[PDB]
Point group: C2
């Protein structure tokens, strides 16, 4: 595996690491996303995940209004955080 | 750095490794993309980057019609292939 492929694999595995804990094993709940942000993106959220921001994040990603983020919906998040990592 | 932050940093450094080769240092030319595909995404392109497929890929990725792939266009490409990777994985 190339370095890029290894990195892409971590994008995949990370989603499932959090999604598979609670509820639907293939969707990220609010709570699973909060954990993902705090543990995986501390540079973006710091030590405390802001409740209102989390609600708006979830709402913007959750295109089918099931209150969860599926992997297709999560790909939008991946694109955003990739751009953010380049710029900031 | 978290495993996810380390992964994102690889996506950023990989882009610039290839984009900075020639021409605009912040955009992937068709040639730069060909190499990136060949060396970095062989599990998606394989051993040869196909020429017709390369032209189709560039066209599909190139939302601003400048015949190159910029960072945002690349970020969308990778998010699409990770949805592909997740399909293969799941
Ligand atoms: Ca879940
Ligand atoms: Ca959803
Ligand atoms: Ca270039
Ligand atoms: Ca372009």
């Amino acid at each position: 595996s190339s370095s890029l492929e290894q990195a892409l694999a971590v994008l995949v595995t990370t989603f499932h690491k959090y999604s598979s804990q609670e509820g639907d094993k293939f969707k990220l709940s609010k709570g699973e996303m909060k954990e993902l942000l705090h543990k995986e993106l501390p540079s973006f959220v710091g030590e405390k995940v802001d409740e209102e921001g989390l609600k708006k994040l979830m709402g913007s990603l959750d295109e089918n209004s099931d209150q969860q983020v599926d992997f297709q919906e999560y790909a939008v998040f991946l694109a955003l955080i990739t751009v953010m990592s380049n710029d900031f």
